[PDB]
């Protein structure tokens, strides 16, 4: 029961290190 994560054009393929950098800081509060 957590708010949906805004991917924001950051596709994440299986078993591949990826970096997500969202402009909204509200996700930082959840983190």
């Amino acid at each position: 029961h957590l708010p949906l994560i805004a991917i924001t054009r950051n596709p994440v393929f299986p078993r591949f290190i990826k970096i997500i950098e969202v402009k909204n800081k509200k996700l930082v509060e959840l983190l």
């Binding site: 596709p11 393929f13 299986p14 078993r15 591949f16």
Partner: protein, 186 residues
Amino acid sequence: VVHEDFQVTEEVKALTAEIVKTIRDIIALNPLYRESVLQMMQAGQRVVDNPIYLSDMGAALTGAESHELQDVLEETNIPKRLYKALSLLKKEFELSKLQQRLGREVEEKIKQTHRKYLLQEQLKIIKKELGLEKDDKDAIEEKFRERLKELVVPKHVMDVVDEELSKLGLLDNHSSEFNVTRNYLD
């Protein structure tokens, strides 16, 4: 997480060879990332515990749209998703090979243009040893000078003719402006 498979794991692994060879072809002809990782995880080393993860990693390199990735994820049967991934790899390969072919075609056209220009320059330097200017028409410059020589001539026409002749010399032979200048001079 469903991982149903057939008991006889003898010929099913054969398609892995084709998949890895296709990946090798893509990376060699379409270098996107460093090739060390492929060496690190070698099929012969037997350290591939979950072939599904290796297949996903290989397909992850594909440039197919995320819609195609979702379509692949929709499939449940292992062979169907394997064939879908192979088709996606072929889809990327078609575009990549077409891009390379078009690039080399344009480059070859440019090279042929430059080479024929070099042959033309060899003509202008060997048959047309510098100084004659027969094709450049500076020989025609001298011809017009001698044509004007005999005439008892006003100064106005000489100054305008000198201006015209300087313009003709400045302008290259093929220019339409050069053609009009030549016609006026004649």
